[PDB]
Amino acid sequence: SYSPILGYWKIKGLVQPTRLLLEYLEEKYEEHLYERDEGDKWRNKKFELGLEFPNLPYYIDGDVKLTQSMAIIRYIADKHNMLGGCPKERAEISMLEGAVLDIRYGVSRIAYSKDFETLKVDFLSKLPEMLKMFEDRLCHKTYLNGDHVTHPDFMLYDALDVVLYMDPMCLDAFPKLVCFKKRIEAIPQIDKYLKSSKYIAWPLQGWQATFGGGDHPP
Amino acid sequence: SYSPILGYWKIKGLVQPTRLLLEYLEEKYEEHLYERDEGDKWRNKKFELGLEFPNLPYYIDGDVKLTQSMAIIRYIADKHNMLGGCPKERAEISMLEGAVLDIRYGVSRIAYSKDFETLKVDFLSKLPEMLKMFEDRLCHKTYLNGDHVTHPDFMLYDALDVVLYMDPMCLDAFPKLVCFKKRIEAIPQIDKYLKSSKYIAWPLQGWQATFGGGDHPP
Numbered sequence: 001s002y003s004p005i006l007g008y009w010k011i012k013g014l015v016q017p018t019r020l021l022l023e024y025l026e027e028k029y030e031e032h033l034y035e036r037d038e039g040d041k042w043r044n045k046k047f048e049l050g051l052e053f054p055n056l057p058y059y060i061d062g063d064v065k066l067t068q069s070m071a072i073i074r075y076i077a078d079k080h081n082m083l084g085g086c087p088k089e090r091a092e093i094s095m096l097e098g099a100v101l102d103i104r105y106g107v108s109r110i111a112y113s114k115d116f117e118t119l120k121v122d123f124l125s126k127l128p129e130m131l132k133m134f135e136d137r138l139c140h141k142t143y144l145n146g147d148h149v150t151h152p153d154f155m156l157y158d159a160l161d162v163v164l165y166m167d168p169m170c171l172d173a174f175p176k177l178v179c180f181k182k183r184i185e186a187i188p189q190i191d192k193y194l195k196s197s198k199y200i201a202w203p204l205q206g207w208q209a210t211f212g213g214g215d216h217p218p
Numbered sequence: 219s220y221s222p223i224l225g226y227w228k229i230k231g232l233v234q235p236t237r238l239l240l241e242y243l244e245e246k247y248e249e250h251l252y253e254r255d256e257g258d259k260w261r262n263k264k265f266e267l268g269l270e271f272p273n274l275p276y277y278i279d280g281d282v283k284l285t286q287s288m289a290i291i292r293y294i295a296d297k298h299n300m301l302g303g304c305p306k307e308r309a310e311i312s313m314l315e316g317a318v319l320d321i322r323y324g325v326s327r328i329a330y331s332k333d334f335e336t337l338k339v340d341f342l343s344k345l346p347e348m349l350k351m352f353e354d355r356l357c358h359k360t361y362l363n364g365d366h367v368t369h370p371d372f373m374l375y376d377a378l379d380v381v382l383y384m385d386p387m388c389l390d391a392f393p394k395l396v397c398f399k400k401r402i403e404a405i406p407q408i409d410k411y412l413k414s415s416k417y418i419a420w421p422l423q424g425w426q427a428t429f430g431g432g433d434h435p436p
């Protein structure tokens with residue numbers, strides 16, 4: 001059975017937590033990566049993939065042809081029996097999910113604004129309230145759902161990576177989160193991935209973004 | 219066993235699709251509604267509910283204490299065996315979910331901007347691409363996942379309701395969506411709900427929003 005395909009821009013963006021989950025699980029996959037100058041190339045292929053809701057990212061494995069980043073990461077998790085063993089645990093994991101997205105989408109939704117520098121002040125003013133809930137969550141816990149890794153762990157990791165670019169001191173007040181970020185980096189298969197040529201360091205958002213864009217870090 | 223509690227602002231906002239699902243399922247529930255002048259009241263209660271990630275909406279039923287609107291609607295769906303019977307169907311439903319949220323969050327993310335009137339032009343320019351995928355999806359289908367209702371049907375319904383306020387003609391080119399909206403309204407338990415005193419007609423977003431705010435429609 002062939003390697004499934006993960007299609008996306010050559011950026012971190014929406015799919016970075018999925019990459020980390022895949023690498024955590026030591027799953028084989030191949031990426032179809034779209035470059036900065038391949039917009040027309042993508043548009044010419046977008047409607048020729050059998051996708052119900054054509055978009056990036058997409059995931060194709062011979063059983064599914066998916067779009068929506070959260071459907072994709074949840075499918076991979078689900079195929080490894082990680083979404084939760086009953087309605088209460090599935091709800092817990094979806095709740096963790098959404099709370100992470102409040103941070104990650106909080107970034108994405110202002111990153112392309114001409115008025116980023118201003119909107120950034122409001123986001124960073126609210127951010128400690130969001131981080132505090134995760135700091136608390138990690139009291140005497142190894143991962144967000146206890147002693148075992150779940151996909152929101154990699155979502156949170158990505159969110160922390162990204163907000164540190166917006167303000168390198170924003171975790172100084174949250175030592176358990178700083179520790180969590182290091183703990184994820186100390187998973188050997190993640191360590192190996194981050195050191196590999198498959199790791200995409202930059203950009204964070206699309207290249208044209210005001211925050212987290214461009215070909216290289218500022 | 220007592221009526222579960224759904225807590226939220228007295229607005230449509232993030233929770234309207236959940237209300238519709240509950241009413242579809244003819245489930246008993248009570249809402250704790252926060253009014254426009256009850257911000258301090260909420261802030262004084264927010265951290266005293268046993269919530270891991272305090273926020274609005276919340277859902278409490280004696281088995282769970284949830285936040286995150288999508289965790290909540292998925293829990294209710296899950297308790298009625300509606301999330302999908304296998305990984306492929308669960309992924310399909312999550313994909314529908316996300317594609318709806320691209321429209322609904324597309325609105326929410328610009329609705330509080332001082333620059334709404336400008337951002338609105340871009341959103342409405344892109345909107346037909348998003349609607350087209352649903353128009354296509356509904357070719358010879360009664361609901362988004364075929365012959366039976368799923369929670370993204372009510373998410374889509376809410377999204378259509380809302381974008382019609384932004385532009386009353388935006389569905390003129392999508393007759394299957396206009397029909398879908400009427401078909402949802404023709405579910406007798408939804409018809410009854412929309413005519414009831416429990417229905418909240420306005421606002422769409424928070425009261426202070428530039429779009430979909432205020433005490434009454436413009």
Ligand SMILES: N[C@@H](CCC(=O)N[C@@H](CS)C(=O)NCC(=O)O)C(=O)O
Nearest residue numbers: 013014055056057068069070316320
């Ligand atoms: N809600 C969707 C949003 C997808 C999206 O906005 N993709 C952007 C890149 S971050 C894109 O370029 N899509 C390509 C297209 O619209 O054709 C998701 O989570 O996957």
Ligand SMILES: N[C@@H](CCC(=O)N[C@@H](CS)C(=O)NCC(=O)O)C(=O)O
Nearest residue numbers: 098102231232273274275286287288
């Ligand atoms: N991602 C969260 C966002 C929740 C959110 O932004 N809630 C707003 C109203 S739409 C609020 O007033 N929360 C109250 C608070 O932050 O204390 C969700 O889907 O539930």
